Design a protein around this ligand. Structure first.
Ligand SMILES: *[C@@H]1O[C@H](CO[C@H]2O[C@@H](C)[C@@H](O)[C@@H](O)[C@@H]2O)[C@@H](O[C@@H]2O[C@H](CO)[C@@H](O[C@@H]3O[C@H](CO)[C@@H](O)[C@H](O)[C@@H]3O)[C@H](O)[C@H]2NC(C)=O)[C@H](O)[C@H]1NC(C)=O
Ligand SMILES: *[C@@H]1O[C@H](CO[C@H]2O[C@@H](C)[C@@H](O)[C@@H](O)[C@@H]2O)[C@@H](O[C@@H]2O[C@H](CO)[C@@H](O[C@@H]3O[C@H](CO)[C@@H](O)[C@H](O)[C@@H]3O)[C@H](O)[C@H]2NC(C)=O)[C@H](O)[C@H]1NC(C)=O
Lengths: 106, 106
């Protein structure tokens, strides 16, 4: 459709903020993630669409880490993990997490 | 010297606990790290020692992530990073960090 840059997919050092309903203080953190624009590349002759099955950029290589939402009541699970992406590409509509200074989250 | 297993070097999902002098609550977390026994392999004929220059297992591949020691005074830096190891080996005495349920740190 429009111009592709719009960065394009790549591991990118961003920030998110982990917190769970009824845990006291939430926690922010930094982890490289893979986000970028993958084109649903139409080719020379159309009509073969759909062009590309929601090819969102998903993790080629992934390591997890997690922290520990401090103060959680003695009945809830404080261990909160997240991706630590190493490289990435674009394949089918893949679910993973969200499916197809610093900060604050309270 | 003695038997080598004693696991041997490998990325290993362990836990550490980040906290800084005069920040209020400390934070624990989980991150794969590379720890293992590397032998200072003496060979068939000695006298060529030292055997191997303090070949501690250090990170072949490494990604950083960091969290945010919550509540830090408005004059201190809450961003605390750590390794997110992908693979590893053994080379010279390499400095990096420490040079040659969950938890609590307060
Ligand atoms: C280090 O941990 C990762 C997983 O991260 C976990 O870390 C713990 C502390 C906690 O925070 C938890 O929430 C995190 O997920 C281990 O990675 C495992 O990798 C295998 C395959 O290599 C996965 O198995 C497969 O999972 C898929 C789902 O996509 C299934 O469809 C398959 O059938 C199969 O089960 C497994 O899910 C991962 N583990 C977890 C808990 O997700 C890694 O192996 C571990 N290292 C060590 C040495 O323990
Ligand atoms: C994503 O971040 C890493 C570094 O992690 C940092 O993350 C920030 C948020 C913060 O927590 C900070 O404390 C963490 O360190 C970037 O990795 C950089 O990699 C380059 C080389 O590939 C490093 O440069 C070299 O560093 C060596 C030291 O061993 C020097 O001897 C060299 O001369 C050279 O300077 C650099 O140190 C790394 N950056 C930092 C801050 O350590 C990674 O590039 C980044 N990604 C993006 C897209 O920004």
């Amino acid at each position: 459709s429009r111009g592709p840059l719009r960065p394009l997919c790549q591991p990118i050092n961003a920030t998110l903020a982990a917190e769970k309903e009824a845990c006291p203080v939430c926690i922010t953190f930094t982890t490289s993630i893979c986000a970028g624009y993958c084109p649903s590349m139409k080719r020379v002759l159309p009509v073969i669409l759909p062009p590309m099955p929601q090819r969102v950029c998903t993790y080629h290589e992934l390591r997890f880490a997690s922290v520990r939402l401090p103060g959680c009541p003695p009945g809830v699970d404080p261990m909160v993990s997240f991706p630590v992406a190493l490289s990435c590409h674009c394949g089918p509509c893949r679910l993973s997490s969200t499916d197809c200074q610093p900060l604050a989250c309270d």
